[PDB]
Amino acid sequence: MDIDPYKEFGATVELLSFLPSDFFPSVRDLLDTAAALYRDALESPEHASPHHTALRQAILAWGDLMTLATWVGTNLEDPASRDLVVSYVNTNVGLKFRQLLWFHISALTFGRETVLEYLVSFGVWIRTPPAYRPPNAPILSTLP
Amino acid sequence: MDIDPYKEFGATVELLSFLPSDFFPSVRDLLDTAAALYRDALESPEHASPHHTALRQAILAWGDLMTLATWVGTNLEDPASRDLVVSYVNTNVGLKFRQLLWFHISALTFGRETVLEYLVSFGVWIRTPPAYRPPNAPILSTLP
Amino acid sequence: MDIDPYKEFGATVELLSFLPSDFFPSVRDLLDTAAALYRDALESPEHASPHHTALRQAILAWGDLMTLATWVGTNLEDPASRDLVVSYVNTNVGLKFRQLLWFHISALTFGRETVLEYLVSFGVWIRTPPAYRPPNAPILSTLP
Amino acid sequence: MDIDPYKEFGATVELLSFLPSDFFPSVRDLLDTAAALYRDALESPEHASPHHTALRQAILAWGDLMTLATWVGTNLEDPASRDLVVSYVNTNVGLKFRQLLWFHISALTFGRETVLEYLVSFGVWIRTPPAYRPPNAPILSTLP
Amino acid sequence: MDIDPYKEFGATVELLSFLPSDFFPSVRDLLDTAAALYRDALESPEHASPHHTALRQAILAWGDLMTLATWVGTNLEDPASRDLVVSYVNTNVGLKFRQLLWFHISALTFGRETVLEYLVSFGVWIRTPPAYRPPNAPILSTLP
Amino acid sequence: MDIDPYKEFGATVELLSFLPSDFFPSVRDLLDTAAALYRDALESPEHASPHHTALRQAILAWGDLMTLATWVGTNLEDPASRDLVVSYVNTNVGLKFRQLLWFHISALTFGRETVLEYLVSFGVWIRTPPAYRPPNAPILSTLP
Ligand SMILES: COC(=O)c1c(CN2CCN(C(=O)CCCNC(=O)c3ccc(C(=O)[O-])c(-c4c5ccc(=[N+](C)C)cc-5oc5cc(N(C)C)ccc45)c3)CC2)nc(-c2ccccn2)nc1-c1ccc(F)cc1Cl
Ligand SMILES: COC(=O)c1c(CN2CCN(C(=O)CCCNC(=O)c3ccc(C(=O)[O-])c(-c4c5ccc(=[N+](C)C)cc-5oc5cc(N(C)C)ccc45)c3)CC2)nc(-c2ccccn2)nc1-c1ccc(F)cc1Cl
């Protein structure tokens, strides 16, 4: 009854379990990137590619929790209520789809195959013990 | 980037603003009806429609929000501090994509064309004042 | 100078007066119809039909009457005289204006043929004795 | 909703603002131009061009603003406030309106080509330094 | 690297040194005239001419300098310390490309050929002493 | 009424918002590079490519502020006047188009596509948290 968010794009939630938590950027940094690079294509009413379809949805989803953050910021009285709730959204639910923002943005910019190869390559990096890991962790980059 | 998802689908948020709040079925019925008859290619690796890709991102979001309601209802202290939040999810944020689930499901069984005419042909039914309104709203259905 | 705003379109004020006054939708409830359905076609720099060129003028004409209901609506010294006039805009100009928007916005969605026939149809249905008539009122609809 | 009343006609408010304000003729002095030249073409039940359909609306739009300047023009209790508003019609609506009539009534007599070129021409001629320019101002004319 | 921009355009800075300081129109009129009739492809992603690319870099520079005048006039303390700077911008640095805007705009409507002849045919008009000078400078214009 | 300085070259001011302030070299270092590599082509009166057209303009623009720096350095008396002004030009207005100098120089040397790919690649570098950023930030380099 539960769908894999990435089963349609080749990747999977288990595969994204490689990437540690702190690896992912903040939601602001990702939203600014899409709104900087793709803002002229996201708002365009065309199916340029499935990531746009997913990316338009993921943005509005976080746009919705911002509402619940603001509603809770004012219509609640207890500090442990008004804070621990909003602390939950940024902490856990925010992390719940910084993957989606990080994934689909990185997929559009770099192609799906380059992202999937990136995950496996990053998987090998993290597996190796600290003594032999090359300190420069692998990082995405285009290729002509 | 401030844009509704209903752009490449030929719609708006104003277009689906005519529909009264009691128009849309419950969230449970929509989720069930999704898996009742779309569970075939909905939870598969296949890609088939652009509606499916947008759909899958909606069902995961509600599963996210329900994780929020379960969290707040069990850990936040005061019901006067949390039942506001719990009822807020089921009431307002739920109705956010309480209709989003409705659009894609209705579009899939019927088509982006037939759903739009039902929306166009509904507002004309609802914009009409009560005294001169037919006693039976138009029925969404496929035309052979 | 008796410039009928409908003589170009195979109609006339007498037919639109032939229907009952209260049948017509409200101004606010009707602007969003084109604003939600035709916001892209109207704002386009190339007209698609004379209804576009005509409806594109009615929207601007209503602009100042709201502005005049806003400038005068908030920049007077006597509130005892503000609603004396500001009420007149929604009183006896909208009645001559809500008819105008309804014609074109219905003319676009259903063609000038069906609207002109509907005016004859509905205007009769309200005249026939109630003992002898189909109680299901006649209405436009995109479906046959 | 930024419905330029000129974007359909290869112009825009900035060009018509590019000319000086006082260049435009008066409303009364301009209505008779179409009323004397185009009283037959406008009142015809078949439009001859989109300028007809557009100019046919501006005349009626000015109708109520005179009526509103007549209803309010004579049906108030405070003359101290009558000219406070009635002056505004000829104050800051005609300025946005005398431009509108001038464009179409000139567009019909001389085609949309010559008017759009004249706006560029005259708007420049008033900008060039007086020491270096033909003092004979540029003007439309039916003769070559 | 010490070179004027008027090289690939077939000109110099000496050639445009004949023109008196009062020759060129104001900076406001040039900026308006740029957007009055070139705003079509001036603020677009298109590349069309080599004049447009040089132009766009001029309009941004003046917007830069005006940001300087606004800054100094509001933050620098003494008018005897700042009005020198403010008037210096509008007077001297303004006239630097007060003519630069004039050359490209005049070149676009007319062509690199026709503008040069007007410059060649102007100096002969201005180098001539006053007693034998025709009372009307040559007029820039296109030749069919 | 405002043009994007980079809208014609594919990039945009938002895209260049990735690069932090201190990343950009000084104006002297860039001018020496162009005057070292391109001084034999900039002064050539030919449109070798649009960056030359932009690059000739950007140089003279900074060449103009050097004049205002020198004029202010001598014809002003107050130290907070003569210093804070010139401090403004080097600090803010200098930074305002060290981008243009850095961009167009890097575009000529490395091709437009390589620069645009560089920005996106640098964008991904800066987004990543410090713990996982490869310490060697990405840097331009040719490719046969
Ligand atoms: C996937 O869709 C859904 O699940 C769904 C649907 C749509 N479907 C399909 C339609 N539907 C039906 O129940 C239809 C069966 C009944 N059939 C009929 O009555 C029927 C059957 C045959 C004929 C027929 O051939 O003559 C006619 C018929 C005509 C047919 C053609 C025609 N011409 C143009 C020539 C003229 C006709 O003139 C008529 C005139 C009549 N007079 C005299 C009054 C009477 C009948 C007719 C009607 C409901 C379900 N709607 C809604 C919804 C929501 C809010 C508000 C309203 N609706 N929500 C959902 C949803 C819910 C939960 C969930 F979790 C997920 C979803 Cl998505
Ligand atoms: C885009 O350009 C501009 O905006 C612009 C222009 C140029 N334009 C176009 C020309 N212009 C006019 O006003 C022309 C209309 C008047 N037409 C006429 O007088 C006219 C029209 C028809 C004929 C005609 O067919 O016979 C003739 C004519 C002749 C024609 C052909 C001919 N042969 C070779 C066979 C012999 C002719 O012998 C004559 C002899 C005469 N006698 C007896 C004295 C009298 C007339 C004629 C003249 C001004 C605008 N200049 C200037 C400028 C600046 C500084 C100093 C001077 N000028 N600044 C700008 C600028 C300003 C602000 C801004 F923000 C941006 C810009 Cl860029």
Kindly write down the DSSP assignment for every residue of D31-98, as one continuous string.
Answer: HHHHHHHSHHHHSSSS-SSHHHHHHHHHHHHHHHHHHHHHHHHHS-S-HHHHHHHHHHIIIIISHHHH
User: What's the token pair of residue D33?
Assistant: 């131009």
CA angle C133, C123, C126 (to 5 degrees): 40
- Cα separation values, C125 from C20, C55, E24, E38, F133, Å: 11, 28, 73, 57, 75
Q: How far is the CA of E100 from the centre of ligand 2 (A)?
A: 20
Query: What dihedral angle (degrees, nearest 10) is formed by the CA atoms of C129, C132, C138, C144?
Result: -160
Task: Report d(CA D86, CA A32) in Å as an integer.
Answer: 50
- Cα separation values, C8 from B43, C61, D41, D102, Å: 56, 19, 11, 22
Give phi and psi for E142, each to the nearest 5: -80, 145
User: What's the token pair of residue A128?
Assistant: 């190796």
User: What's the token pair of residue B17?
Assistant: 């603003």
Give phi and psi for F36, each to the nearest 5: -90, -40
User: What's the token pair of residue B57?
Assistant: 């991102």
CA angle E16, E19, E24 (to 5 degrees): 100
Residue C132 corresponds to which amino acid? Y
Burial F53-85, CB ≥16 within 10 A → b, else e = bbbbbbbbbbebbeebbebbeeebeeeebbebb
Task: Report d(CA C61, CA C63) in Å as an integer.
Answer: 5
Kindly write down the DSSP assignment for every residue of C110-134, as one continuous string.
Answer: HHHHHHHHHHHHHHHHTTS-TTSS-
User: Is E56–F5 a contact, with Cβ atoms under 8 angstroms apart?
Assistant: yes
Burial E33-48, CB ≥16 within 10 A → b, else e = bbbbbbbeebbeeeee
For chain E, what percentages of helix, strand and coil (3-state, to nearest 5) are there? Answer: 65, 0, 35
Nearest atom of ligand 2 to the alpha carbon of E23: 55
* Residue C101 CB neighbour total at 10 angstroms: 22
Q: How far is the CA of E137 from the centre of ligand 2 (A)?
A: 10
Task: Report d(CA F36, CA F40) in Å as an integer.
Answer: 8
Task: Report d(CA A39, CA B135) in Å as an integer.
Answer: 45
Is the Cα dihedral A75, A79, A84, A87 positive or negative?
A: positive
Task: Report d(CA D90, CA B96) in Å as an integer.
Answer: 47
Q: Which residues contact A48 (CB under 8 A, 6 or more apart)?
A: A41
* Segments in chain A forming alpha helices (H): 27-37, 39-42, 50-74, 79-88, 94-96, 98-110, 112-127
Residue A79 corresponds to which amino acid? P
User: What's the token pair of residue B1?
Assistant: 């980037």
Q: Assess contact for E72 and E86: CB atoms under 8 A.
A: yes
- Neighbours, chain E (3 or more CB pairs < 8 A): D, F
Q: Is C119 exposed, middle or buried (0-12, 13-18, 19+ CB in 10 A)?
A: middle
Atom 48 (ligand 1) nearest CA = B139
Q: Assess contact for F60 and E4: CB atoms under 8 A.
A: yes
Q: Which residues contact B43 (CB under 8 A, 6 or more apart)?
A: A2, A3, A4, A7
Residue F62 corresponds to which amino acid? W
Residues in chain A: 144
The DSSP symbol for C6 reads S
CA angle B26, B28, B30 (to 5 degrees): 70
A56 contacts in chain B (CB < 8 Å) = 3, 5, 7, 54
Task: Report d(CA B95, CA B82) in Å as an integer.
Answer: 19
Q: How far is the CA of B139 from the centre of ligand 1 (A)?
A: 4
Please report how many Cα atoms fall inside a 13 Å half-sphere around the Cα of residue D139, on the Cβ side.
8
Residues in chain C: 144
Nearest atom of ligand 1 to the alpha carbon of B136: 44
| Residue of B136, B139, B142 best suited for mutating to test ligand 1, as the one with most atoms within 8 Å of CB | B139
Q: Which residues contact E87 (CB under 8 A, 6 or more apart)?
A: none
Q: Can you give the resolution of this entry in Å?
A: 4.0
Task: Report d(CA A72, CA A84) in Å as an integer.
Answer: 10
* Residue D136 CB neighbour total at 10 angstroms: 7
Q: Is E130 exposed, middle or buried (0-12, 13-18, 19+ CB in 10 A)?
A: exposed
Task: Report d(CA F89, CA D76) in Å as an integer.
Answer: 61
Task: Report d(CA E143, CA F14) in Å as an integer.
Answer: 44
Residue with structure tokens 């050639």? E15
Kindly write down the DSSP assignment for every residue of F83-106, as one continuous string.
Answer: HHHHHHIIIIIHHHTHHHHHHHHH
* Segments in C19-94 forming alpha helices (H): 27-37, 39-42, 50-74, 79-88
Q: Which residues contact B17 (CB under 8 A, 6 or more apart)?
A: C32, C36
User: Is D2–C43 a contact, with Cβ atoms under 8 angstroms apart?
Assistant: yes
- Cα separation values, E71 from C32, E64, E76, E86, Å: 44, 11, 8, 10
Q: Measured in whole angstroms, how far is the alpha carbon of residue E70 from the centre of its chain?
A: 22
User: What's the token pair of residue F64?
Assistant: 């103009």
Question: In 3D, which of A62, A86, A6 has the Cα closest to residue B61?
Answer: A62
Task: Report d(CA E30, CA F77) in Å as an integer.
Answer: 34
Q: Which residues contact F109 (CB under 8 A, 6 or more apart)?
A: F37, F142
Q: Assess contact for C61 and D57: CB atoms under 8 A.
A: yes
The DSSP symbol for C21 reads G
| Rg over CA atoms, chain D | 17
User: What's the token pair of residue B103?
Assistant: 């659009």
Kindly tell me the number of DSSP H helices and DSSP E strands found in chain D: 6, 0
Q: Assess contact for F24 and F99: CB atoms under 8 A.
A: yes
Is the Cα dihedral D8, D10, D15, D19 positive or negative?
A: negative
Q: Which of D127, D133, D136 has the most E C-beta neighbours within 10 Å, making it the best mutation to test the interface with E?
A: D127
F12 contacts in chain A (CB < 8 Å) = 36
Give phi and psi for B131, each to the nearest 5: -65, -30
* Residue E70 CB neighbour total at 10 angstroms: 11
- Cα separation values, D95 from D20, D88, D92, E37, E119, Å: 11, 10, 5, 22, 40
Q: Assess contact for A53 and A47: CB atoms under 8 A.
A: yes
Minimal Cβ distance to F96: which of E64, E76, E89: E64
Q: What is the 3-state secondary structure (H, E, C) of chain B?
A: CCCCCCCCCCCCCCHHHCCCCCCCCCHHHHHHHHHHHCHHHHCCCCCCCHHHHHHHHHHHHHHHHHHHHHHHHHHCCCHHHHHHHHHHHHHHHHHHHHCHHHHHHHHHHHCHHHHHHHHHHHHHHHHCCHHHCCCCCCCCCCCC
Give phi and psi for C140, each to the nearest 5: -65, 160
Q: Assess contact for E99 and F64: CB atoms under 8 A.
A: no
Q: Assess contact for C10 and C116: CB atoms under 8 A.
A: yes
| Residue of E31, E141, E143 best suited for mutating to test ligand 2, as the one with most atoms within 8 Å of CB | E141
According to CATH, what is the number of the domain C1-144?
1.10.4090.10
User: What's the token pair of residue C52?
Assistant: 């576009």
E25 touches ligand 2 (CB under 6 Å)? yes
The DSSP symbol for F129 reads -
Q: Measured in whole angstroms, how far is the alpha carbon of residue F107 from the centre of its chain?
A: 11
Task: Report d(CA D72, CA C85) in Å as an integer.
Answer: 7
Q: Which of F17, F132, F143 has the most A C-beta neighbours within 10 Å, making it the best mutation to test the interface with A?
A: F132
B142 touches ligand 1 (CB under 6 Å)? no
Q: Measured in whole angstroms, how far is the alpha carbon of residue B66 from the centre of its chain?
A: 16
Q: Is F118 helix (H, G, I), strand (E, B) or coil?
A: helix
CA angle E34, E40, E46 (to 5 degrees): 110
Q: Which residues contact D80 (CB under 8 A, 6 or more apart)?
A: none
Task: Report d(CA C134, CA C128) in Å as an integer.
Answer: 10
Q: Assess contact for D23 and D30: CB atoms under 8 A.
A: no
Q: Which residues contact E43 (CB under 8 A, 6 or more apart)?
A: F2, F3, F4, F7
Q: Assess contact for E19 and E122: CB atoms under 8 A.
A: yes
Residue with structure tokens 């009364």? D28
Task: Report d(CA D106, CA D99) in Å as an integer.
Answer: 11
Q: Which residues contact C89 (CB under 8 A, 6 or more apart)?
A: C65, C66, C68, C69
Q: Assess contact for C51 and D14: CB atoms under 8 A.
A: no
Q: Assess contact for A60 and A29: CB atoms under 8 A.
A: no
Residue C12 corresponds to which amino acid? T
Question: In 3D, which of C143, E59, A112 has the Cα closest to residue F2?
Answer: E59
D124 touches ligand 2 (CB under 6 Å)? yes
User: What's the token pair of residue E142?
Assistant: 């296109």
| Rg over CA atoms, chain C | 17
The DSSP symbol for A129 reads -
H/E element holding E56?
Answer: helix E50-75
